[PDB]
Amino acid sequence: EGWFMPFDNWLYQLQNADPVEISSSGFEIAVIDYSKDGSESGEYSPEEIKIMVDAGVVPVAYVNIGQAEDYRFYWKESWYTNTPEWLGEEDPAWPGNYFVKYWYNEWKEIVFSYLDRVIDQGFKGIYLDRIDSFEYWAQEGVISRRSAARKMINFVLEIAEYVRERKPDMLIIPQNGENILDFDDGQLASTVSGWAVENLFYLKTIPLEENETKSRLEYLIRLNRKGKFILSVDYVDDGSDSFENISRILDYYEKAKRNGCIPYAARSDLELDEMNVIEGIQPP
Fold first, then answer.
1. How do 206-207 and 202-203 pair as beta strands?
2. Of 6, 115, 158, 184, whose CB is crowded by the most CB atoms within 10 A?
């Protein structure tokens, strides 16, 4: 069910991204972190980002809007002792990431200050992680599911207003949480430029139940039909030249393209640490 696909490929790399390497790789759109090491001192310069723009690559900045990350410029040492009401527990699965009450003004103003830097660096899109934080707080019983969903929708809308006031063409791509559209009045679906998803056909190496995949696709197809691109990333490539492995990459690409999803086969380590070239396939 796969028609609106304005990019031939995409790159997801959050560590060790190299503008020169990317600029001459043949990837069309690259989602990287806004810093070489995530930290303030590693922030890409306007010039380093312009290398990619100059080669016709569309560079997009990852921004985690559902969790505080303890190595970022915004993190404060005082938060360990005098903990803000909106800073919650550490993510068992991602040490150094903390769930936040993303509806509190102070968290929003941190995220706006991060967007401020991303705009000035010359990024052409933002890729917004932990939309699914709405599910986390609902599971914790801290607020209602509807409350959380609304709050996250409104926040992404406020993020769209902030960045488009400065850069009207800025792309806006949330990651995961696409089921949040159940609570959208349609303004979020129209405001995004596209939507990115992890673990659609495969959870790492392991193929998913077809029903689970179809529920997710129900949301993505609707967006596609409205002129919104869908970036897929499955962590299917185990690094080997095995037969199993390459057949799996090819199965993933075929399932992706047949349903309108632009695929990126990433390493099953989850590190997103290199530009993952796969001879004859990625880029294609």
1. antiparallel
2. 115
